[PDB]
Design a protein around this ligand. Structure first.
Ligand code: NA
Length: 1173
């Protein structure tokens, strides 16, 4: 290459290929070229080649300049067919331009090298010699020497465009890491895995696992394939047929220095394209091993991180190794969540563990002789774990621990030692045998299995960290325990895989980057290359997704608990009888109405239902019957609501009456199926509106009719043809046919849940599926047993979610104005990622609706692409200010939405509107007048500290190290006083948070799923109650606290927090049907009762939701009742102790204001006997 050839191409692949060729090329992209730069380059050229799309007119100025300069010019098209005008305008022979066109059309490093010689010899009559153009295959192998490794074959799939450019260094580095891990790398390039060639799929049959760096293969419109959509259209059957693990190795389109600098690991583009959508394929999400770097010429190269290459290679080899290890030789760690061992939402963790261990033994695993496995006794198993696994014991030498600890990045070891001291720390360190230290790890070992309680996060060991350190790193004991599960320590367990039981553990919530884990990230240091298999509740998409992305988890999702109607009992049932009698007297003997009214009022007062009904006094006689219409609706709703009627056991599909009740609950909703609303609710098809206006009596009659039809269909073996014969109602018959055709066969997949855990332990491909609630008209989340995906994060809110958010906004405003006669100045709303995934964005739409901003959709992709403010005349009301508390996971998974909501606030803050029309602008102008900072004045979105998660108040309540509202607010603010949005990015903004929280008139939280309630999860009182308490601390007055009920999108309702608490209390908490159901589930059933006491306490401590009569009933039903006390004592005495302690704490703090002395004495006696038992 002596003569200089100038290559001007709008395809940077051409320019990189020319650089890779080693020939004497100059290169530039005409779209990034000034006139001076062109003439400067032309002065150095002996031959010029121009390749552009659009023909001569697309760069006429540049082409005319080259031709006028006299240098021989070769003009070719970027289109496949050559451009005859470019051929003729070239100042070489036509055949020279035509052959050059072919060299560049085929492309690749070889063709660019021969092109240089072809042009020199042809135009300048040099004598280099040249090869004709060579075709480049649509797919092929990156040829490398065989290192002779004997491990599994790991395919590496990368883009053909990178192969042609010669930018394969990032692939070579991953191949070398695979060889270092003992595997055999099979690097393959291709244009797409969606349209994969047959011979390419054949070649992949020789792989034991695949690391892919290409986009998802199932389709091109993921927004149409999520829950309720056309998931069949997302097709990866050609890749699933290989039945091997497929791991996404992340190749960031951002530079490595930015990745190292921030906790915001991936750009919003990379979150969507390399994580969220690839999850639709069932791919395992790993870490970034290469990063996009740009040089001076604007040419892109991907540069690999060798350490991250080792993590990707190690993960791939470990997953492939699973297929090679027979069950008899396979070592498995079974890890239980803690903080109360076995936390798993909706799941009977002990019974599921027994059933899993029994199935593993049957498959040939060596499960030893664990208590309760042979005897089929979940209580025996979990009691054995508590006795020998709570935090013979495993001992890790301080020397070996330090040797591993020292291999971590200083960024991580500095923080760990700053909080926990130099290794091996002071937590569970024994100096008896070795004076230098041994870290003691409690675990239950049997055969090739270890059962371990997940190590504690560490906030119990340091309550000061609750007030100041949401970013508390894992302790040395935490790290030692997980590192002992792996290989490395001389006495290491050497697990082939980890199985974590149920939603959810704390490893995937440790401090670190949002996703794209680094070597300094807590989850990465703890888990390493260990495969993680994770049974997970199907209607908790956000929490499952966090495990997928921060701990490369393979989920095996599981069914919701059995559900049934709450029904009536006790004085609620007696009130039902009196209401019916009142209706008869009204129609037949209106003069007797005062007598039956007195009976009803006596009952309401005696049973404390005036608290449920918000009645401060007796209505006037001529307003009493109108009040009973409100009682009618209240009684109907607490009787009709679905509540759990047991707990799910892994692999156990409901049968008999439990199948009937669950199918009835599923069929009650209007079905979103195949993206359409074709099948109505069963009771809708039978006459009910289900919009919140149906009369109490007709709801019961229609429910009885619906139950009769489904019970008859069940009696036929769910025969689809029996539908038309069971009812002359065409709509009802279509619903029954839908139940037999879709609901029942998909429900049947629940029996494969344990089989899919075994398949995952064997390194087989686990099929993916949608996530969400099958009680919200989303039947395609069934079958379970799948590694679920969630949503297109750029397509929220959907149009259906927009409708719901508007209804939520309208319903909240109507309730507030009805009570106060004026609009609320500001609404505070807590927004979770799991909620956006369950609903496709109801919360987000509500914020936009309150601000008066409409989303703008691209109808093709269904993605949100813009915003459009509604004018005040159309809004008909002022723009309501909104303060948003996002969770840490919402920040992680929906970065486009965080920016979207911030854009909307700034949009409406800037509109020149009157204060009476725009509360956002009014508040922003007041703040702007205070400190003059425009960005601060429009700050509305707050969340967890960057790199961290949680709201802190669960830790505070469990530590009990608090006294007043100032303490509650300080912890809440320490964990959530951080601003998000453009140029905010999680910076501390305590003063801005206080300014906005002082304005909150309504603190709102939405309940979007029926499988659990606000007394079933700590997150509601933490976020919702935490907001209430923080506003009260700042202002001295609690804001209004509302619950938005979007469990039924076609019947959105708003109620106060007090109303929702009493509804949950009567319909579930002290409902004898629910208590009896939990007493069928031993330890975990008792656990759920104790958790309910804690979460009611948490909501009372923060928002005052409890009345003394509710504490009295809670104490009697849960603790003092002989039947429940006996059950608690046998199955879970630890939970009984915690319940009595918590109720005594409520009395000590005055939250329970006037407890009877005899009742407190009974509680103290329970404490004493339980310690003695
Ligand atoms: Na010519």
């Amino acid at each position: 290459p002596e003569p200089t050839v100038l290559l001007l191409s709008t395809s940077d692949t051409d320019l990189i290929s020319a650089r890779s060729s080693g020939k004497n090329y100059r290169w530039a992209n005409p779209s990034r070229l000034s006139d001076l730069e062109l003439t400067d380059l032309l002065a150095e050229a002996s031959i010029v080649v121009i390749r552009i799309l659009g023909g001569y007119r697309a760069w006429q100025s540049g082409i005319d300049t080259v031709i006028a300069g006299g240098v021989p010019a070769v003009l070719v098209s970027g289109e496949q067919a050559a451009d005859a005008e470019l051929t003729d305008r070239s100042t070489v022979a036509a055949g020279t331009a035509l052959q050059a066109h072919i060299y560049l059309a085929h492309g690749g490093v070889d063709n660019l090298r021969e092109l240089h010689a072809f042009l020199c010899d042809t135009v300048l009559m040099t004598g280099f010699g040249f090869t004709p153009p060579v075709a480049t295959p649509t797919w092929g192998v990156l040829e490398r020497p065989d290192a002779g490794k004997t491990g599994p074959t790991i395919a590496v799939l990368y883009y053909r465009a990178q192969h042609l450019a010669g930018n394969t260094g990032y692939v070579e580095a991953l191949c070398r890491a695979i060889e270092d891990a003992g595997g055999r790398p099979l690097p393959l390039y291709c244009a797409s895995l969606r349209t994969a060639e047959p011979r390419l799929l054949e070649r992949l049959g020789g792989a034991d696992a695949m690391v892919v760096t290409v986009l998802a293969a199932g389709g091109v419109k993921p927004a149409a394939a999520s829950a309720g959509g056309d998931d069949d259209s997302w097709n990866v059957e050609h890749l699933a047929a290989l039945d091997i693990p497929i791991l996404q190795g992340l190749c960031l389109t951002s530079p490595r220095d930015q990745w190292c600098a921030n906790d915001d690991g991936l750009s919003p583009l990379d979150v969507a394209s390399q994580v969220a959508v690839p999850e639709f394929d069932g791919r395992i999400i790993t870490v970034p091993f290469s990063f996009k770097e740009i040089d001076d010429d604007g040419l892109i190269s991907y540069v690999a991180d060798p350490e991250r290459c080792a993590r990707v290679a190690g993960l791939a080899v470990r997953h492939a190794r699973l297929r090679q290890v027979a069950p008899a030789d396979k070592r498995v760690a079974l890890v239980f969540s803690a903080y109360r061992i076995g936390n798993a939402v909706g799941l009977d963790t002990p019974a599921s563990a027994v059933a899993l261990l029994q199935a593993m033994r049957q498959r040939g695993y060596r499960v030893g002789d664990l208590p309760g496995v042979e005897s089929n006794d979940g209580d025996a198993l979990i009691h054995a774990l508590i006795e020998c696994g709570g935090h013979n014991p495993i001992r890790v030498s301080a020397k070996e621990y330090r040797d591993w600890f020292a291999t971590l990045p200083a960024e991580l070891t500095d923080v760990v030692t700053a909080y926990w001291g130099p290794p091996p720390g002071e937590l569970f360190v024994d100096r008896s045998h070795d004076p230098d230290g041994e870290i003691v790890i409690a675990a239950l070992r049997a055969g090739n299995l270890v059962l371990m309680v997940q190590p504690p996060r560490g906030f119990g060991e340091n309550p000061v960290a609750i007030y100041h350190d949401p970013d508390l790193p894992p302790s040395h004991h935490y790290l030692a325990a997980y590192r002992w599960l792996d290989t490395g320590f001389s006495n290491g367990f050497g697990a082939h895989a980890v199985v974590h039981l149920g939603k959810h553990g704390n490893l995937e919530w440790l401090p670190g980057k949002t996703l794209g884990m680094s070597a300094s990230c807590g989850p990465d240091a703890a888990l390493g290359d260990l495969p993680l298999i994770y049974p997970f509740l199907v209607n908790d998409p956000g929490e499952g997704t966090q495990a997928k992305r921060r701990a490369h988890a393979v989920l095996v999702d599981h069914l919701i608990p059995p559900m049934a109607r709450a029904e009536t009992y006790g004085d609620i049932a007696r009130l039902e009888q009196l209401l019916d009698e009142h209706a008869s007297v009204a129609a037949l003997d209106p003069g007797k109405l005062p007598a039956i009214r007195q009976q009803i009022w006596t009952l309401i007062r005696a049973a404390k239902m005036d608290h449920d009904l918000g009645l401060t006094e007796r209505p006037e006689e001529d307003s009493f019957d109108d009040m009973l219409l409100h009682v009618d609706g209240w009684l109907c709703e607490i009787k009709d609501v679905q509540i759990r009627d047991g707990l799910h056991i892994l692999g156990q599909n409901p049968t008999g009456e439990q199948e009937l009740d669950l199918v009835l609950a599923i069929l009650r909703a209007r079905q979103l199926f195949g993206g359409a609303h074709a099948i109505p609710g069963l009771r809708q098809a039978l006459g009910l509106a289900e919009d919140g206006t149906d009369e109490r009596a007709t709801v019961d009659q229609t429910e009885a009719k619906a139950r009769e039809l489904v019970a008859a269909l069940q009696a036929t073996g769910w025969d689809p043809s029996a539908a038309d014969r069971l009812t002359g109602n065409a709509d009802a018959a279509a619903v029954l046919r839908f139940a037999a055709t879709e609901v029942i066969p998909r429900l049947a997949g629940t029996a494969t849940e344990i089989e899919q855990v075994l398949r995952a332990l064997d390194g087989r491909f686990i099929p993916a599926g949608p996530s969400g609630s099958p009680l919200r008209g989303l039947v395609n989340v069934l079958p379970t047993g799948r590694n679920f995906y969630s949503v297109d994060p750029k397509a929220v809110p959907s149009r259906l979610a927009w409708e719901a958010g508007v209804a939520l906004a309208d319903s909240l405003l109507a309730r507030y104005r009805d009570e106060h006669g004026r609009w609320p100045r500001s609404v505070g709303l807590s927004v979770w990622g799991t909620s956006a995934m369950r609903t496709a964005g109801d919360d987000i739409a509500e914020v936009l609706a309150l601000l008066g901003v409409r989303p703008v959709w691209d109808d093709a992709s269904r993605r949100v692409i813009d915003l459009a403010p509604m004018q005040p005349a159309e809004l008909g009301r002022p723009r309501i200010d909104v303060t948003v508390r996002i969770s840490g996971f919402f920040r992680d998974a929906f970065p486009h939405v965080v920016t979207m909501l911030d854009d909307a606030v700034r949009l409406v803050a800037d509109l020149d509107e009157a204060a009476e029309d725009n509360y956002v602008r009014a508040h922003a102008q007041a703040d702007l007048a205070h400190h003059g900072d425009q960005r601060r004045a429009t700050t509305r979105i707050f969340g967890s500290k960057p790199g961290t998660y949680g709201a802190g108040l669960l830790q505070l309540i469990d530590s009990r190290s608090w006294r007043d509202d100032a303490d509650l607010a300080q912890v809440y603010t320490a964990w959530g006083g951080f601003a998000y949005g453009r140029d905010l990015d999680g910076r501390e903004a305590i003063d801005d948070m206080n300014r906005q929280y002082r304005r909150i008139a309504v603190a709102a939280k939405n309940t979007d799923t029926r499988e659990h309630d606000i007394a079933d999860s700590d997150d509601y009182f933490q976020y919702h109650g935490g907001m209430v308490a923080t506003v009260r601390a700042l202002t001295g007055q609690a804001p209004a606290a509302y619950i938005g009920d979007n469990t039924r999108p076609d019947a959105i309702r708003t109620r106060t927090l007090s109303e929702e608490t009493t509804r949950v209390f009567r319909a579930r908490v002290v409902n004898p049907r629910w208590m009896a159901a939990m007493r069928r589930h031993g330890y975990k059933g008792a656990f759920e009762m104790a958790a309910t006491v804690d979460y009611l306490f948490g909501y009372d401590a923060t928002a005052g939701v409890m009345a003394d009569w509710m504490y009295e009933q809670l104490t009697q039903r849960y603790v003092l009742d002989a039947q429940n006390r006996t059950f608690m004592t046998e199955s879970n005495p630890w939970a009984l102790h915690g319940m009595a302690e918590r109720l005594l704490e409520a009395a000590g703090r005055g939250l329970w204001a006037q407890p009877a002395p005899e009742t407190l004495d009974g509680l103290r006696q329970v404490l004493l006997e339980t310690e003695g038992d």
